Design a protein around this ligand. Structure first.
Ligand SMILES: Cc1ccc(NC(=O)/C=C/c2ccccc2)cc1C(=O)Nc1cnc2[nH]c(-c3ccccc3)nc2c1
Length: 240
C-alpha cells in the first residue's frame, strides 16, 4: 500500500483528454481539478514524487494502483505547457513577467538541488502554467545540454544549470527553438567550439549575464541555483 497516497478511483470524474500513457482532465470528489495519467518503471515516477514537494513543482495528489490501468493524479495546470504558453498566450503576460517565470523555475530547481535530485530534462516543454500564470516544473535533448554531457555523458547539478540557462533563453525568445537554424549535430559541434545562444531582444544585458553564466565551458565555473536565485531577485529589484 502507498498509505495516504492511495486514491479511490470512484472519487474521480473524467472530463477531457489532455495528451497521449494518456493524461486526462477531471475532478476529484467533484471539488478539485486534477490531471490523471494512465499507463514498475511507471510507478517509479510516483515514488519520486511522493518524496518531493514544493510550490513550483507539479504536485502529486495520489495514485490508483489496485486497478488496471494504474492512475497517477496531480494538480491541474489550467494554462498547459510553458512552451505553448510562450508561443500562443502572449496577450496574457508583459515583459516584466518573463523574469517571474524564470524565478518560478529557479525556485523549483534550488529545491531539487538541495535534495541532490537531478531533473535531466529541464526545458519549456517540461514546465506547466496554472490559471494565475505561475510556472511549475514537471516531466536526446541536445539543444539543452552542456558539452560534457554531449561528449562524455557527464550528468551533474551543473548540467541542470546549463539546461536552466537555455530555458531562460526560451522564455526571453518567447518559445523559439534554441539554435533555430542548426541541426542537433551542428549544435553539438558549435557548442564544443564555444559558440553560445545570442541575447534575445527582450533580455536586458543583466538578464543575459545570468543566462550566459549558466553556459561556462567549465562545469565547476557555473553558478548554483542558490546563486542564480539571488541574481534573478537582484535584477528583479533593479528592473521593477
Ligand atoms: C498527471 C501527471 C502525473 C505525473 C507527472 N509528473 C510530474 O509532474 C513530474 C514531476 C517532477 C518529478 C521530478 C522532479 C521534478 C518534477 C505529471 C502529470 C501531468 O502531466 N500533470 C498535468 C497537470 N496539469 C496539466 N494541464 C495540462 C494542459 C492544460 C491545457 C492544455 C493542455 C494541457 N496538462 C497537464 C498535466
Amino acid at each position: 500500500g502507498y498509505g495516504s497516497w492511495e486514491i479511490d478511483p470512484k472519487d474521480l470524474t473524467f472530463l477531457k483528454e489532455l495528451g497521449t500513457g494518456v493524461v486526462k482532465y477531471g475532478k476529484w470528489r467533484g471539488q478539485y481539478d486534477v490531471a490523471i495519467k494512465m499507463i514498475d518503471e511507471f510507478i517509479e515516477e510516483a515514488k519520486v514524487m511522493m518524496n518531493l514537494s514544493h510550490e513550483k513543482l507539479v504536485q502529486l495528489y495520489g495514485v490508483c494502483t489496485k486497478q488496471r490501468p494504474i492512475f497517477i493524479i496531480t494538480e491541474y495546470m489550467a494554462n498547459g505547457c510553458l512552451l505553448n504558453y510562450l508561443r500562443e498566450m502572449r496577450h496574457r503576460f508583459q515583459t516584466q513577467q518573463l523574469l517571474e517565470m524564470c524565478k518560478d523555475v529557479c525556485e523549483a530547481m534550488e529545491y531539487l538541488e538541495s535534495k541532490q535530485f537531478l531533473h535531466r530534462d529541464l526545458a519549456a516543454r517540461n514546465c506547466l502554467v496554472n490559471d494565475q500564470g505561475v510556472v511549475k516544473v514537471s516531466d536526446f535533448p541536445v539543444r539543452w545540454s552542456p558539452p560534457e554531457v554531449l561528449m562524455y555523458s557527464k550528468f551533474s547539478s551543473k548540467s541542470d544549470i546549463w539546461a536552466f540557462g537555455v530555458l531562460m533563453w526560451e522564455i526571453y525568445s518567447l518559445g523559439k527553438m534554441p539554435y533555430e537554424r542548426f541541426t542537433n549535430s551542428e549544435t553539438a559541434e558549435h557548442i564544443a567550439q564555444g559558440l553560445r545562444l545570442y541575447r534575445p531582444h527582450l533580455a536586458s544585458e543583466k538578464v543575459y549575464t545570468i543566462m550566459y553564466s549558466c553556459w561556462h565551458e567549465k562545469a565547476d565555473e557555473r553558478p548554483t541555483f542558490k546563486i542564480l536565485l539571488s541574481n534573478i531577485l537582484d535584477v528583479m529589484d533593479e528592473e521593477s
